[PDB]
């Protein structure tokens, strides 16, 4: 099915299509297709069957040679082995996190359910690169360190200009685990070293310690509707709630709720909400049917929620625990937090605007990434280590793992620190 979740995370102007298909072969796609301007800004899915030929490449299903199509200038010829009915090692799953500075928040939601990351570095922009400072320290808080620094766009960028950047991005994430992350120089043009990289996504990224016997904690970050326009009356179905499960094996036919849910009718205050219970219609394994949803993987969990509950991606960051799920539904929230001394996620060649941020003031909205959830709320009483925020929607902490707090210092909320749920 899937046992791991590797994030394909990378900053602007490095290309996403030639590198994700090199490691997976299944393209990440959504609307506006009309695909993408520079790099993929959507939180897309990618799933594949990585294997070996007693050779650490990831071969194609035609596994005699690996003649890729990333350029016509030089013919990229790597030898992944030969034919002979390859042995299936494992099933690999990817979580394609957004890599622009504008979409930092949805990056934090999709990466909070994953198990691993790749750092896709362009050699084009500034060598003290801001998103490499952003993403890695964000990975450090979300209990992940499975990082492969993958310097992606150095094909026109010379070996001395590429030399400066991976040194200087590592110089600012010196308070972050990225020193156990190998820095792999590859080609987005010659599809090169993918026989070495897909070794590392097996080597550096094994199967994480994943709770199989626990309660199913699906956290949907992507909504899918099989009740598409062009359907009929006797073609009645549910809505597919497809996210990564971080805890507990999930079965077909399970009555699953969305535990943060919806506000009930005539809420004169803030505290009344009901989870939307739904029986699971099917479980997807990269092309294949199963009755089990082994967690630690991006699993298509088709549920019996309504067509409107999946006609848009409306379940971004929702704890879909089973019927009668334990974790509570908070609409006012007591947070403990720390504020990072660098305004992380934005830094130019003049080091703007990563200076020290003014403290949080009361009755000011701030994005909290609680568990893996995407919600915004104003703080009622703000202290140094005691934040009392009230949320516009009742949201569920799956567990008190981490929150990511951002302050609206510009057009988008920008990371000022992190914290935890008290």
């Amino acid at each position: 099915q899937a046992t791991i979740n590797i994030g394909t995370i990378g900053h602007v102007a490095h290309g996403k299509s030639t590198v994700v298909k090199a490691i997976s072969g299944v393209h990440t796609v959504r609307f506006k297709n009309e695909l993408e301007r520079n790099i993929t800004i959507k939180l897309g899915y990618a799933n594949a069957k990585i294997y070996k030929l007693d050779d650490p490449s990831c071969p194609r299903p035609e596994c005699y040679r690996s003649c890729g199509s990333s350029t016509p200038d030089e013919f990229p010829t790597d030898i992944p082995g030969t034919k002979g009915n390859f042995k299936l090692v494992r099933h690999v799953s990817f979580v394609d996190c957004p890599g622009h500075d504008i979409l930092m928040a949805t990056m934090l939601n999709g990466a909070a359910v994953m198990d691993a990351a790749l750092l896709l570095i362009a050699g084009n922009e500034s060598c003290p690169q801001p998103q490499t400072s952003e993403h890695l320290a964000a990975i450090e808080i979300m209990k992940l360190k499975h990082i492969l620094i993958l310097q992606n766009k150095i094909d026109l960028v010379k070996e001395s200009q590429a030399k400066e950047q991976y040194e200087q991005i590592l110089a600012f994430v010196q308070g972050t685990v990225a020193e156990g992350a190998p820095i792999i120089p590859i080609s987005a043009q010659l599809k090169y070293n993918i026989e070495v990289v897909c070794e590392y996504i097996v080597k550096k990224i094994p199967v994480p310690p994943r709770d199989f016997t626990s309660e199913p904690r699906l956290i949907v970050i992507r909504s899918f509707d099989v009740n598409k326009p062009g359907c009929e009356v006797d073609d009645l179905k549910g809505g597919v709630a497809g996210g990564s499960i971080l805890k507990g094996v999930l079965k077909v036919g399970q009555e699953i709720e969305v535990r943060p849910g919806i506000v009930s009718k005539d809420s004169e205050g803030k505290l009344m909400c009901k989870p939307i219970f739904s029986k699971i219609v099917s479980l997807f394994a990269e092309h294949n049917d199963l009755q089990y949803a082994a967690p630690g993987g991006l699993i298509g969990v088709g549920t019996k929620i309504d067509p409107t509950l999946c006609r848009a991606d409306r379940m971004v960051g929702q704890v879909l625990g089973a019927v009668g799920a334990l974790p509570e539904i908070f609409t006012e929230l007591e947070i403990s937090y720390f504020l990072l001394r660098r305004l992380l996620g934005v830094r130019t060649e003049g080091d703007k605007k990563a200076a020290k941020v003014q403290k949080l003031s009361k009755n000011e909205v701030l994005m909290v990434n609680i568990g893996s959830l995407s919600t915004g709320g104003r703080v009622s009483a703000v202290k140094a280590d005691l934040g009392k925020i009230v949320l516009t929607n009742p949201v569920c902490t799956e567990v008190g793992e981490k929150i990511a707090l951002s302050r609206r210092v510009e057009k988008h909320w920008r990371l000022i620190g992190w914290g935890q749920i008290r």
Binding site: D155, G180, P185
Partner: peptide, 17 residues
């Protein structure tokens, strides 16, 4: 960290013009 750089340096940059 950088031993995976310099090994894949001579592997990639000897194939780059």
């Amino acid at each position: 960290s950088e031993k995976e750089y310099v090994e894949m340096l001579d592997r990639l940059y000897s194939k780059l013009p």
